[PDB]
Structure 1
Amino acid sequence: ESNFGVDFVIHYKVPAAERDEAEAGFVQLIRALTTVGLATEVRHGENESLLVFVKVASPDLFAKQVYRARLGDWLHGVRVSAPHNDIAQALQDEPVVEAERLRLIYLMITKPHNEGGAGVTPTNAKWKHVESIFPLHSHSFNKEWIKKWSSKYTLEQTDIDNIRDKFGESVAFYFAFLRSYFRFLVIPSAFGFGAWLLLGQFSYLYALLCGLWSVVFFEYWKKQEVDLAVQWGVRGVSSIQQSRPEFEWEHEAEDPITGEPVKVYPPMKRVKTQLLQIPFALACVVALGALIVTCNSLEVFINEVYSGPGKQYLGFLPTIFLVIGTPTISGVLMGAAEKLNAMENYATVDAHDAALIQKQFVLNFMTSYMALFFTAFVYIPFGHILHPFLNFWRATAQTLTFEFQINPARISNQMFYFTVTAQIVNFATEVVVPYIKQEDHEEEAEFLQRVREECTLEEYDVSGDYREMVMQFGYVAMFSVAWPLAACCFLVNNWVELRSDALKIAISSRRPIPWRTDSIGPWLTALSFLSWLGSITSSAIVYLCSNSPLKAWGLLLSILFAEHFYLVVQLAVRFVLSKLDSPGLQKERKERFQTKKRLLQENEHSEKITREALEEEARQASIGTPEEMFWQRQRGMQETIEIGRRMIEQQLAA
């Protein structure tokens, strides 16, 4: 019921057709890991694969690897404090967590021979037989962490920090983002229930309240992430770039910024294939745009010809067919989001995911809101354009079988359907995968059985759940005025999602390779664009749905005021939160000072000043006469006093 001290496990699938190649690749593989010091053990595997097992035998090699990497961060402004002990006295001062151990094991299996490692990245030239490298999961800790989280109402700061200790900094930021979003969701939750009782449908004051809250939360989290990165000491790691393993280069570069020549790729080949997203996004506009308008017009056509024999669940049934249908059609578009992104050669693995997301978000931006956008910005202001699409469907239904009444209250029903049915099918997909999983020395067989299962588990992507919580922010920031129970219905989800995603890392995936990132990433832009867009369409909805024919005086002012209510209250909160004097920033200017105070500690009056007058009076004697005779006029300071006093009475005589 425990591990055997193993750090990482390499899969190395061996097929039948490339048998002699994979066998010769294996002995070349197992040679390479032994040079960098990995104590190696080979075990059996399923589908005729060979799971080799690695660990660091020599601690003083391993502590030197810790001492090398801690020196490597200290050069880049990551660590303010120097190690100062070339022998392991620095390591006894600051001990290695299990995250900092496993990364430096993973660096010794991935870094090339330039950086002192055996690079066994699978996507490079040979070893296409190595399928995956993974650390084994500790089920002993894992059972406690679920149990201790499931009994807890709230999550303390020591609960989030324990995730950093064993799962890395990038995984711990997702729970630290979620917890600080779960807590900040209660403010439009409770006020979204009070606006349901008091204010009624489409109030103006809730839109100004939500557009205030979405600034206050987002500016608070940007302050909180620079405090947490100080606390884990990962502040500034985004400034470090790490080169990509599968990055291809045409030539090496000269005149570098770091100083040593780097391998580069001419951007005219990259800006060609980056321009390929412009027809790809525009086709995906008219893919999803034609898809919504053929479901939305058909849905409004069916309530006119059947007159609703069932209830309103039957009236919106293709819209329900869209929400159960969208996580499939998001799956095919994320595949084209990743193939188009890997085709573009990106330099760093930070700037590779920094442009994956702004392709991944915009594609998810279309498929999650343009169904709602067509209700409140096409159907409500002018449904006269869809009247060709209605009678076109009337041409079929008469041949098949052998008065528009545009309701302003359609979106509040539609926002209700996008809220709960997406929350059902999400919690359906977070319950069905729990329900779809449900020789050799005769001692480690149960140990080996959990490993043989763990290769079948997929990797856990942290970005796959940021994209949900950002899209969950989009319903609250933009369209929550249509149904202010959404912030009430998201808050019950974010409690269980904080324990559902804790369960998803627990049993439905292997342990991720621990990484280091300062911020959440490029989501801080996508959380900020949704906040600003949640000022315009939060005000433009409450003007239309609360509607006299609609005047452009009314819309263009209600947009301009609330969008400039945003920019004022953005500058107020940025002013206020600058003056909160965060404890992560007080310590950083402090602890930098004592290290300089260390080097500070590393390193008569009248009688002196006459001697340089004696010095210059020798040099006029050796060789001008205005300059020397000016200064030697009053030689000592006592001579300056008496002449200074006698010039007063000389003036006082006059």
Structure 2
Amino acid sequence: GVDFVIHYKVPAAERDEAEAGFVQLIRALTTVGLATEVRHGENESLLVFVKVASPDLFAKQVYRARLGDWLHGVRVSAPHNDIAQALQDEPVVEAERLRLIYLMITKPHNEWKHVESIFPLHSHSFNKEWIKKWSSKYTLEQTDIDNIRDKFGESVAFYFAFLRSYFRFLVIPSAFGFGAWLLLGQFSYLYALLCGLWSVVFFEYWKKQEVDLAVQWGVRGVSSIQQSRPEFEWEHEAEDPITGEPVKVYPPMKRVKTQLLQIPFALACVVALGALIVTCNSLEVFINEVYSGPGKQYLGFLPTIFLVIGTPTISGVLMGAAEKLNAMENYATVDAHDAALIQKQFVLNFMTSYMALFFTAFVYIPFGHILHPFLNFWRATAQTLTFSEKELPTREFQINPARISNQMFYFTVTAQIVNFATEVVVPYIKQQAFQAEFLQRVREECTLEEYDVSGDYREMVMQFGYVAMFSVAWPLAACCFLVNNWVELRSDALKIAISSRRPIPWRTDSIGPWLTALSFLSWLGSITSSAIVYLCSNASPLKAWGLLLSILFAEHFYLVVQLAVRFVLSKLDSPGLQKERKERFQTKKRLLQENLGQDAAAAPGIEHSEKITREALEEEARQASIEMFWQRQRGMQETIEIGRRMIEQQLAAG
């Protein structure tokens, strides 16, 4: 097991001595401001190793960070022992350390004229047992995820927390999905209902989980604490309505107006990518269904090639408009900025993941006769390419309902197998192609890319969409994903260890933008599922009332289930919210104890009512100093006897 003695590593690119020297000078000048540097240079770029010297001055800042998080309400419990030494009963976590030191480097004490990167080194001793402990287990445990947070951070930890929770909830649709396939058959108006019921439950349950995890890990509300973006544009400067600190203000409603440009942007993505996909699909239909002679197997690959060339090209242009629009929307924090870019990308992701299926389930199978003009375009076009005047041989366009079954098999089986290769084997091959002890190891790790949680997030989010929307045409889809996800936990853990450098510890109290993505896919999947069932069941397909009622009932079934599930979960106890609400109580309680001598939160004796008589006496006397207003027959019994006397008097009248 190889060891490490470094906290962070800073490589400074060496182009020309003039600026490279200046870079090395002041970067050193600043780093030594608070942290030790040992600078050994390898691979034509100098490597500045940085670690905290004084542990006394470090824990003084770690504790100061604990206070900051607690002050703004991010941390549930204060470190109010007030002595930093004895406060290490809650010891400094490696992620907590690595994060806080990263800040000292990356706070406004740096970022420095094209520094190559800043990254911590891995822990081979930890990564070994990591992939080992998980490859032996059939079932992961919460403490395993807690360990992930400890060494890497909540940003990485939540994904595994999400993937794990999504994995076990995926058992349910694997159950009645197998049962639907085994008994009920394809296109069942029952699996769709159970799929909608499931999607609502899993989503609402995970939202409830995120609060608990945020409280457990003490990151609840960390999103509005992180450093604001440098290139954030602000019109004026005011006071924080909470903290009172000088915050730079930019009109929220002015941002809302700018964010309205996502509506035409989204349509542009649906049109651009959609036209690209529906075109390749028409070729796929023309080449296979409509014959076109020898070389068909050679020709069959050609439309697939168009996708590979077309997708990054068209979406790359659209991404430029996204990145440009993202800056215009002007986000205060790095958290909000990257979360908005991801949402913009989701429209691109949606198209390149489902449009092939939409074309099949809503255009191809239920109608298909509208594809004839598309087919003729390829008929004439291919004739030109042939160069020979003779017509390409042709046969009647016949609709094959097995198309939706073949595509679903790809996305659920074949596409997931080539995923394991692309996500793991291809990066590992790159290492093989590349092919003191610290330095060689550090050379290696310097090369790798930073781990991106977003890539792993969408792979599962887009996968969920397949279940929510198109699994009614292939009920065995959930089972294929269930198997994949077990390996996905292992595989993603494996690539973090050896295929990428250790990511900077970063904190979030939610999966973020992916929540809306899941929620949208779940809703649209209620319309999609039922609509597919009606159209693909194959009486004449009466689009008028037949299609719309199927959608009307299933969508409203989804909406009612939504209200039902939330209602039930709202009456269940929530550990996360209970902790925060209890600390707040006791904190308020403590001040009361200190201020009032422990005695607050009995009833006076009857004899005290004589003191009551005394106060009435004192009132009368003060009024006696000075008409009907002050009348009292004082004493307990005097009133009783008068009232008693009244009782027999009133019956005397009767």
Quickly name the TM-score band, shorter chain normalised: 0.7 to 0.9
Task: Measure how far apart 1:538 and its partner are.
Answer: 0.3
C-alpha contact (below 8 Å) 1:78/1:236 kept by paired residues: yes
**Which secondary structure does the structure 1 equivalent of 2:269 belong to?**
helix
1:464-507 CA-partner distances (Å, limit 9, x unpaired): 21111110001010001122222121112111111111012111
Task: Measure how far apart 1:562 and its partner are.
Answer: 0.7
C-alpha contact (below 8 Å) 2:10/2:48 kept by paired residues: no
Task: Measure how far apart 1:433 and its partner are.
Answer: 3.1
360 and 16 in structure 1: CA distance in 2 versus 1, 3 angstrom threshold: closer
Task: Measure how far apart 1:359 and its partner are.
Answer: 0.3
C-alpha contact (below 8 Å) 1:9/1:135 kept by paired residues: no
Output the TM-score relative to the length of structure 1.
Answer: 0.86
- Asked if 1:560 corresponds to 2:559, the answer is no
The aligned residue for residue 599 of structure 2 is none
563 and 201 in structure 1: CA distance in 2 versus 1, 3 angstrom threshold: same
**CA–CA distance in 1 between the matches of 2:22 and 2:501?**
24
- Asked if 1:339 corresponds to 2:324, the answer is yes
Task: Measure how far apart 1:407 and its partner are.
Answer: 2.5
33 and 524 in structure 1: CA distance in 2 versus 1, 3 angstrom threshold: farther
Task: Measure how far apart 1:305 and its partner are.
Answer: 4.2
324 and 412 in structure 1: CA distance in 2 versus 1, 3 angstrom threshold: farther
Q: 1:28 aligns with which of 24, 34, 57?
A: 24
The aligned residue for residue 98 of structure 1 is 94
1:80-129 CA-partner distances (Å, limit 9, x unpaired): 323223322662342221122222212222333899xxxxxxxxxxx213
C-alpha contact (below 8 Å) 1:288/1:366 kept by paired residues: yes
1:292-349 CA-partner distances (Å, limit 9, x unpaired): 2221111211234438989999968735974798578767765664455346431122
C-alpha contact (below 8 Å) 1:323/1:421 kept by paired residues: no
635 and 311 in structure 1: CA distance in 2 versus 1, 3 angstrom threshold: farther
**CA–CA distance in 1 between the matches of 2:453 and 2:445?**
18
**Which secondary structure does the structure 2 equivalent of 1:275 belong to?**
helix
317 and 560 in structure 1: CA distance in 2 versus 1, 3 angstrom threshold: farther
1:236-260 CA-partner distances (Å, limit 9, x unpaired): 3335464123424455346856433
1:568-620 CA-partner distances (Å, limit 9, x unpaired): 11111111222222333444434443333323432461242233223323322
**Which secondary structure does the structure 1 equivalent of 2:439 belong to?**
helix
Task: Measure how far apart 1:645 and its partner are.
Answer: 3.2
**CA–CA distance in 1 between the matches of 2:41 and 2:7?**
8
Task: Measure how far apart 1:365 and its partner are.
Answer: 0.8
Q: Which moved more, 1:36-45 or 1:76-85?
A: 36-45
Q: Which moved more, 1:584-593 or 1:217-226?
A: 584-593
24 and 475 in structure 1: CA distance in 2 versus 1, 3 angstrom threshold: closer
C-alpha contact (below 8 Å) 2:146/2:157 kept by paired residues: yes
Q: 1:12 aligns with which of 8, 11, 16?
A: 8
1:164-220 CA-partner distances (Å, limit 9, x unpaired): 111111111000000011111121123222222222222222111211111111111
C-alpha contact (below 8 Å) 1:202/1:542 kept by paired residues: yes
14 and 484 in structure 1: CA distance in 2 versus 1, 3 angstrom threshold: closer
Q: Which moved more, 1:272-281 or 1:72-81?
A: 272-281
The aligned residue for residue 508 of structure 1 is 499
C-alpha contact (below 8 Å) 1:80/1:591 kept by paired residues: yes
C-alpha contact (below 8 Å) 1:249/1:263 kept by paired residues: yes
Q: Which moved more, 1:186-195 or 1:604-613?
A: 604-613
The aligned residue for residue 649 of structure 2 is 650
**Which secondary structure does the structure 2 equivalent of 1:53 belong to?**
strand
1:497-526 CA-partner distances (Å, limit 9, x unpaired): 111110121111122111221111121111
C-alpha contact (below 8 Å) 1:211/1:534 kept by paired residues: yes
412 and 350 in structure 1: CA distance in 2 versus 1, 3 angstrom threshold: same
Q: Which moved more, 1:630-639 or 1:570-579?
A: 630-639
147 and 330 in structure 1: CA distance in 2 versus 1, 3 angstrom threshold: farther
Task: Measure how far apart 1:137 and its partner are.
Answer: 1.4
**Which secondary structure does the structure 1 equivalent of 2:8 belong to?**
coil
Give % identity. 100
Task: Measure how far apart 1:272 and its partner are.
Answer: 7.9
Q: Which moved more, 1:609-618 or 1:574-583?
A: 609-618
The aligned residue for residue 434 of structure 1 is 427
419 and 143 in structure 1: CA distance in 2 versus 1, 3 angstrom threshold: same
Task: Measure how far apart 1:48 and its partner are.
Answer: 3.3
C-alpha contact (below 8 Å) 1:324/1:425 kept by paired residues: no
**CA–CA distance in 1 between the matches of 2:525 and 2:309?**
25
39 and 210 in structure 1: CA distance in 2 versus 1, 3 angstrom threshold: same
619 and 346 in structure 1: CA distance in 2 versus 1, 3 angstrom threshold: same
10 and 285 in structure 1: CA distance in 2 versus 1, 3 angstrom threshold: farther
- Asked if 1:172 corresponds to 2:157, the answer is yes
Task: Measure how far apart 1:54 and its partner are.
Answer: 2.4
Task: Measure how far apart 1:459 and its partner are.
Answer: 1.1
C-alpha contact (below 8 Å) 2:9/2:49 kept by paired residues: no
Unpaired stretches in structure 1, ≥5 consecutive residues: 116-126
Unpaired stretches in structure 2, ≥5 consecutive residues: 388-395, 596-606
1:398-447 CA-partner distances (Å, limit 9, x unpaired): 344463222233211222223333213211212333432449xxxx9111
Q: Which moved more, 1:392-401 or 1:127-136?
A: 392-401
C-alpha contact (below 8 Å) 1:11/1:132 kept by paired residues: no
187 and 512 in structure 1: CA distance in 2 versus 1, 3 angstrom threshold: same
**Which secondary structure does the structure 1 equivalent of 2:169 belong to?**
coil
1:39-76 CA-partner distances (Å, limit 9, x unpaired): 31222233433322222323332222122222212222
Q: 1:234 aligns with which of 204, 219, 235?
A: 219
Q: Which moved more, 1:144-153 or 1:425-434?
A: 425-434
13 and 98 in structure 1: CA distance in 2 versus 1, 3 angstrom threshold: closer
10 and 458 in structure 1: CA distance in 2 versus 1, 3 angstrom threshold: farther
C-alpha contact (below 8 Å) 1:9/1:51 kept by paired residues: no
Q: Which moved more, 1:369-378 or 1:53-62?
A: 53-62
C-alpha contact (below 8 Å) 1:357/1:522 kept by paired residues: yes
587 and 389 in structure 1: CA distance in 2 versus 1, 3 angstrom threshold: same
382 and 336 in structure 1: CA distance in 2 versus 1, 3 angstrom threshold: same
**Which secondary structure does the structure 1 equivalent of 2:98 belong to?**
helix
C-alpha contact (below 8 Å) 1:134/1:513 kept by paired residues: yes
Q: Which moved more, 1:386-395 or 1:149-158?
A: 386-395
**CA–CA distance in 1 between the matches of 2:281 and 2:612?**
94
Count of residues paired in the alignment: 631
Task: Measure how far apart 1:643 and its partner are.
Answer: 3.1
395 and 114 in structure 1: CA distance in 2 versus 1, 3 angstrom threshold: closer
C-alpha contact (below 8 Å) 1:8/1:55 kept by paired residues: no
**CA–CA distance in 1 between the matches of 2:173 and 2:238?**
53
Output the TM-score relative to the length of structure 2.
Answer: 0.86
**CA–CA distance in 2 between the matches of 1:308 and 1:416?**
27
166 and 10 in structure 1: CA distance in 2 versus 1, 3 angstrom threshold: closer
**CA–CA distance in 1 between the matches of 2:457 and 2:363?**
30
C-alpha contact (below 8 Å) 2:270/2:347 kept by paired residues: no
345 and 307 in structure 1: CA distance in 2 versus 1, 3 angstrom threshold: same
**Which secondary structure does the structure 2 equivalent of 1:580 belong to?**
coil
1:258-306 CA-partner distances (Å, limit 9, x unpaired): 4333234567986786566555444433321221222111121123443
517 and 259 in structure 1: CA distance in 2 versus 1, 3 angstrom threshold: same
